[PDB]
């Protein structure tokens, strides 16, 4: 069920490598750290690919954090229910800037207890998203995977997806 698309052309260097093209559909068999095992859907060839040369070609709607048709002030109530906490987050289609996305994360502060902060995910050319121009991402899956492990810039760490 797990499918990626190649961002770059790669020409093998090690024995066991799979070579591939920009725009090629590969399917993942194993995820060992930095060299994943894949089968190309174009040739049928198998081998190890460099992890950062590919992005998830897997539907966003199955993902726990992605709340398709949701609105700013609701995202704030969605998060403000019991069952959630600081670090709880979600991504939602931008009602304002159509074509776009926003990030809603519950946060704590001494003073006004518990804010829910919104951020703007800016679009890149073709393969890309970002929140800080310092790091750019090929897809939403890769953005989310980076910030749940580091907060760099964000005013919290993305602890948990929103629980409905």
């Amino acid at each position: 069920d797990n499918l990626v698309i190649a961002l770059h052309s790669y020409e093998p260097s090690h024995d066991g490598d799979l070579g591939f093209e920009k725009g090629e559909q590969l399917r993942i068999l194993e995820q060992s750290g930095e060299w994943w095992k894949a089968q190309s859907l174009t040739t049928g060839q198998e081998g190890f690919i460099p992890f950062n040369f590919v992005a998830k070609a897997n539907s966003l709607e199955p993902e726990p954090w992605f709340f398709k048709n949701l609105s700013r002030k609701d995202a704030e109530r969605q998060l403000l229910a019991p069952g959630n906490t600081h670090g709880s987050f979600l991504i939602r289609e931008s009602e304002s800037t159509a074509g776009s996305f926003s990030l809603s994360v519950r946060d704590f502060d001494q003073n006004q207890g518990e804010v829910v902060k919104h951020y703007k995910i800016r679009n890149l050319d073709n393969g890309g998203f970002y929140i800080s121009p310092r790091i750019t991402f090929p897809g939403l899956h890769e953005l989310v995977r980076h910030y749940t492990n580091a907060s760099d810039g964000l005013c919290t760490r993305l602890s948990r997806p929103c629980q409905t």
């Binding site: 800037t97 902060k117 951020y119 703007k120 800080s132």
Partner: peptide, 9 residues
Amino acid sequence: EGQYQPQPA
């Protein structure tokens, strides 16, 4: 635009 927070960079 219309802007939320300030873009962390």
